[PDB]
Paper text:
The S2E12 heavy chain uses VH1-58*01, D2-15*01, and JH3*02 genes, whereas S2M11 derives from VH1-2*02, D3-3*01, and JH4*02 genes. The heavy-chain variable gene nucleotide sequence germline identity is 96.53% for S2M11 and 97.6% for S2E12, showing a low level of somatic hypermutation for these two mAbs. The concave S2E12 paratope recognizes the convex RBM tip through electrostatic and van der Waals interactions. Specifically, S2E12 utilizes the heavy-chain complementary-determining regions (CDRs) 1 to 3 and the light-chain CDR1 and CDR3, respectively, accounting for two-thirds and one-third of the paratope buried surface area, to recognize residues 455 to 458 and 473 to 493 of the SARS-CoV-2 RBD. Nearly all the S2E12 contacts with the RBD are mediated by germline-encoded residues with only one out of five heavy-chain (G109) and one out of four light-chain (G94) mutated residues contributing to the paratope.
Numbering used by the authors:
A (entry chain H): 1 to 226
B (entry chain L): 1 to 216
Write the structure that this text describes.
Amino acid sequence: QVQLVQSGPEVKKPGTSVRVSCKASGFTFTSSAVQWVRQARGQRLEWVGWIVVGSGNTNYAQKFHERVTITRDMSTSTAYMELSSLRSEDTAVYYCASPYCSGGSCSDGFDIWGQGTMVTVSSASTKGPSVFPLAPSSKSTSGGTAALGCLVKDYFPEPVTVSWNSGALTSGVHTFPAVLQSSGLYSLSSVVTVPSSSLGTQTYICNVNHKPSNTKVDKKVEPKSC
Amino acid sequence: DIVLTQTPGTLSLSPGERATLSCRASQSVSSSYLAWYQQKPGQAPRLLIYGASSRATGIPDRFSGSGSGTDFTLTISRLEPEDFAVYYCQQYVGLTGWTFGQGTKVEIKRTVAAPSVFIFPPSDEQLKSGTASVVCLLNNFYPREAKVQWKVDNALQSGNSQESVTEQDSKDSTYSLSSTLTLSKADYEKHKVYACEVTHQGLSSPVTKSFNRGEC
């Protein structure tokens, strides 16, 4: 199929450099171009620069012209963005995009997009989450519905994966976006609403995985009788 | 550099309705260098319109673009469920200096739905570790606007809570929200009554969920 495939997530200390790759398949990359655009969570798209694949001719945005390099390897149909002297404000998802080309003919605009690469820039050090139960009780039982969950607290970096009952429980799950705390660590809750009558006959276990800290936690959430 | 300003910030519309999205440029932009993109949560942008009015390959007829100079419009003649997304304009004048608008979110308008409200005291396990998180959950409400206030022994709290909200649900068009009050174990043990007070259009008066520390 026609696609751009980007390299995996990056976690970098301030002052370092990051290199993100963008692999083209299913179209005539030699006729094409690659732009780089970034997006911080809940913020607008920001243009970094672009390269024409044939010539290798580059053009960078004012903000990045002293610390970005865009390159391509035509033999591997790959483009790269190298961003140096990283700062916390560089934390964003970075996207590559190309005009579709078939032989010499190309789309006017950038219609093929990579899946994005998460880049975190922080002074914070790798830390595994503390996983605490949010136990169902009379205070979390509304009509015939109970709420229960797991608090996944004080981890770095993103992401954590949270499943319920090894992926068997998906309906009614809310895994909230992580909040960055003043400490530089992340915290989130994963909750599920269930029929209150299920609490006696169905076990609820939150499965928390944090690969960077080698953390695997399976927390059984026990109902309270009060 | 050229600044693009989009209006409105959020459009709340029923499926089947017409959507009109505005993009104003701080400087005169030629119609040849204005694009529109669609973006859904956790997805890359999708090109809709190039050169102000040209549909990208395979883009449906219901998407159209108009304008030039400092004023551009994207129209969606009849909103389909798959059209609820954020929309960005972009100017690409010259070889550099390309900029995007801040985006317009086109959100599904549904009937008012009051949240169900749930409160969770700190776990015994967390208190042992020296911190106390009190969690207030709002389940499956509409619209998005909700006021969640923390009261500790009837005192309004400030600067010690954080909210997190889900994306609008693809099937029931509701939101869910967590509010977390974070205290030192010491500060938690000084007070008795912990209350989450929820104000929402679906509630004729605010709903309070509360507990006495150590009772359950």
